[PDB]
Structures are given as structure tokens and as C-alpha cells.
């Protein structure tokens, strides 16, 4: 099931490190959560709609910010329709869209935006190769 993917392939130990993502999830592109980590933020429906709209119209959240469970992430450079990236002080967020899914990764210090992006894009790219 999808819970296995979050636990074993998102919340895994990051390479050459003891760290791991603060939380993670896998959503459908329709915005229904398929699986999430125990400490995944209590997101609101309109926050997910905004993320869905950002993959349809890139750069829409850039001036105003990306919100998750009330927490604002300063939007940073991302791949249009594919990856959304955000900064919240020390922490951040990486959202990777595939054919049928959206893979969320949320990190904290000392995890880099590149390492969250590695975990999230690696899994996203596997699900793309498997035809999803």
C-alpha cells in the first residue's frame, strides 16, 4: 500500500546522514491524500487546491506564498508543472508531481533543500517510470 512508500521511501534515512524528513505524504493529483507520515501537517482543503492550481499555472503562489497547515513557505525556484519548492526559515517543503500523484516532503534544519529534493524527486521519478 501507499503507507509503505511513505515509511520506507520518503521517511527513510538520507544518504551519508542520520537525518530524515520531518514529515511526508503522497496525494493524488485530485488532492485526496493516499498516505502520510504521523507528523504530517494538518493541512486545510484550500491549501491543497492552491498547490494543485500552482502545477496548472506556475508562479501563482510566488508573490503571496505557499501555505500548509497555516504555515507560510516562501516560494523558491521550481520546475513548471513538476516541482514546487518552498522555504520556511530553517525548514522547507518539496512537492513533486507525477502523472497521477503529488509527493510531499517537508524538512527541518540541518536538512538541505537539495536533500529533500533528492528524496522527493527520486520517488516521484520512480512512479513516473512505473507509469504513474
Amino acid at each position: 500500500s501507499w503507507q509503505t512508500y511513505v515509511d520506507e521511501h520518503l521517511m527513510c534515512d538520507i544518504e551519508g546522514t542520520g537525518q530524515h524528513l520531518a514529515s511526508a505524504a503522497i496525494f493524488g493529483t485530485d488532492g485526496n491524500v493516499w498516505a502520510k507520515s504521523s507528523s504530517f501537517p494538518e493541512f486545510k482543503p484550500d491549501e491543497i487546491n492552491a498547490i494543485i492550481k500552482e502545477f496548472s499555472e506556475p508562479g501563482a503562489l510566488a508573490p503571496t506564498g505557499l501555505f500548509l497547515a497555516g504555515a507560510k513557505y516562501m516560494v523558491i525556484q521550481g520546475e513548471p508543472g513538476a516541482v514546487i519548492r518552498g522555504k520556511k526559515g530553517a525548514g522547507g517543503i518539496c512537492i513533486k508531481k507525477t502523472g497521477q500523484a503529488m509527493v510531499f516532503g517537508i524538512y527541518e534544519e540541518p536538512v538541505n533543500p537539495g536533500q529533500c529534493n533528492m528524496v522527493v524527486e527520486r520517488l516521484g521519478d520512480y512512479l513516473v517510470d512505473q507509469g504513474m
Partner: peptide
């Protein structure tokens, strides 16, 4: 519904 996940990667 969520579609079935593919086989776990190596």
C-alpha cells in the same frame, strides 16, 4: 479511489 501502488523499488 487511490490506484494500486507499483511493486516496491530495490
Amino acid at each position: 479511489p487511490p490506484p494500486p501502488p507499483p511493486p516496491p523499488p530495490p
